[PDB]
Design an enzyme around this catalytic site. Sequence first.
Site, PDB file in Angstrom:
ATOM      1  N   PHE A   1     -24.370  22.869  -9.646  1.00 26.35           N
ATOM      2  CA  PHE A   1     -24.481  22.681  -8.209  1.00 26.35           C
ATOM      3  C   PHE A   1     -23.583  21.565  -7.693  1.00 26.35           C
ATOM      4  O   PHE A   1     -23.015  21.696  -6.618  1.00 26.35           O
ATOM      5  CB  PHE A   1     -25.925  22.363  -7.838  1.00 26.35           C
TER       6      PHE A   1
ATOM      7  N   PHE B   1     -18.803  25.133   2.016  1.00 22.24           N
ATOM      8  CA  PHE B   1     -18.649  23.774   1.518  1.00 22.24           C
ATOM      9  C   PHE B   1     -17.652  23.716   0.370  1.00 22.24           C
ATOM     10  O   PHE B   1     -16.776  22.843   0.328  1.00 22.24           O
ATOM     11  CB  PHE B   1     -20.059  23.231   1.144  1.00 22.24           C
TER      12      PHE B   1
ATOM     13  N   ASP C   1     -24.990  24.927   3.699  1.00 18.33           N
ATOM     14  CA  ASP C   1     -23.859  24.852   2.771  1.00 18.33           C
ATOM     15  C   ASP C   1     -23.999  25.905   1.694  1.00 18.33           C
ATOM     16  O   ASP C   1     -25.013  25.986   1.009  1.00 18.33           O
ATOM     17  CB  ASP C   1     -23.745  23.475   2.170  1.00 18.33           C
TER      18      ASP C   1
ATOM     19  N   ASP D   1     -28.164  28.678  -2.072  1.00 19.28           N
ATOM     20  CA  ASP D   1     -27.321  28.766  -3.281  1.00 19.28           C
ATOM     21  C   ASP D   1     -27.669  27.773  -4.334  1.00 19.28           C
ATOM     22  O   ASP D   1     -27.076  27.856  -5.436  1.00 19.28           O
ATOM     23  CB  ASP D   1     -25.827  28.557  -2.921  1.00 19.28           C
TER      24      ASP D   1
ATOM     25  N   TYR E   1     -15.826  14.789   0.949  1.00 16.84           N
ATOM     26  CA  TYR E   1     -16.976  15.360   1.666  1.00 16.84           C
ATOM     27  C   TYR E   1     -17.686  14.251   2.503  1.00 16.84           C
ATOM     28  O   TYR E   1     -18.501  14.607   3.345  1.00 16.84           O
ATOM     29  CB  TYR E   1     -17.937  16.140   0.795  1.00 16.84           C
TER      30      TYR E   1
ATOM     31  N   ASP F   1     -30.259  28.651   4.259  1.00 19.94           N
ATOM     32  CA  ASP F   1     -29.483  27.458   3.908  1.00 19.94           C
ATOM     33  C   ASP F   1     -28.183  27.430   4.677  1.00 19.94           C
ATOM     34  O   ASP F   1     -27.646  28.429   5.148  1.00 19.94           O
ATOM     35  CB  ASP F   1     -29.237  27.573   2.400  1.00 19.94           C
TER      36      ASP F   1
END
Lengths: 192, 192
Positions: free
Chosen positions: B41, B15, B9, B142, B62, B7
């Site tokens: 999350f 992030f 981010d 994650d 973001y 992964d």
Amino acid sequence: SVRVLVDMDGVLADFEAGLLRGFRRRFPEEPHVPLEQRRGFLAREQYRALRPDLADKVASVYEAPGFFLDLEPIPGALDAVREMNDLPDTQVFICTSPLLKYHHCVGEKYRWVEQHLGPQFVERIILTRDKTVVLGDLLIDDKDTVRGQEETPSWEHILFTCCHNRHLVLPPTRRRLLSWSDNWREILDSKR
Amino acid sequence: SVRVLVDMDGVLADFEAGLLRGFRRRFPEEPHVPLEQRRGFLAREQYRALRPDLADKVASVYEAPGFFLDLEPIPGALDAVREMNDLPDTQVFICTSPLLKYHHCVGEKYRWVEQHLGPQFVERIILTRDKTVVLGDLLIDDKDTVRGQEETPSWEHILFTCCHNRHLVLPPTRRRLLSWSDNWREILDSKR
Ligand SMILES: [Mg+2]
Ligand SMILES: [Mg+2]
Ligand code: NA
């Protein structure tokens, strides 16, 4: 459920026509490759063969801002993918490779899908340089060979006819889609 | 060969730390969620719970140009993915999902990889909103659960610890990597 991976350039978006029109516009004095003389997946190498200086010129067309954004749809493609997506027990992903010179390609591909097919199809984009690691039943793609780290991909490659591959003759153990009018539903039905 | 999907981010690129830094810079008067208090999350929904109008303010961070490009690497991550990519009989792909608001995310992710890991790693990027249709042995990610159209992915999900998932208590069937200084090589070995 049948999962169909649908290629972008040469299947949904007319890269080859866009390349030639941009080349004719920007390099009007130079020799060009008419679409039906195209042979081989890499246009740049056929232009190099025509005259060495043409390789960088033709690259400058498909590497330019706007090139991917402005491509025209392949006839029948957008209706077919809409129809396909709406079939019961069918799922569609748009499985496309970026150029090595990615800068004006990756975002423009996402915007092209958004504009031509809408936000629901943006969520079904898979960008990858290796399509063999994407699981599916079928891959409809104009590239004559689709290779990568899986020696035996999950999907069956269905060659989508395009100027550069037209000359090839598939053996009877393989299938070609001549166009989006060439009864794609029967190919999906073979996997149900 | 063992194929590891890594992964971006939360695993390569930080992030959450970039989000908080950008929020405090843009909205210096506002309450914030310290990283140690992050739960779940989606940061946006925790901010919404803090005060409803904070949800859009955090999203504006973001969604801004530069946000993805400027993320700092996760400690140890770049060295680990460099070492992993060079192990015998090991394949690495960077498997990352763009935002729905893709515009300033997709191209910036490619450039981030190019700058931090080099051109050869750009060729190993897979952008997808569905990681379950990507073939591999391991997915180091994650997100607390990684779901999609394959009910039983090919890969084993290794939960990479991040602020927002640390408190999650999992059954012993789900494995966790605490950090890139945890024993990731043994996890790879368990698939050889
Ligand atoms: Mg193609
Ligand atoms: Mg993540
Ligand atoms: Na459907």
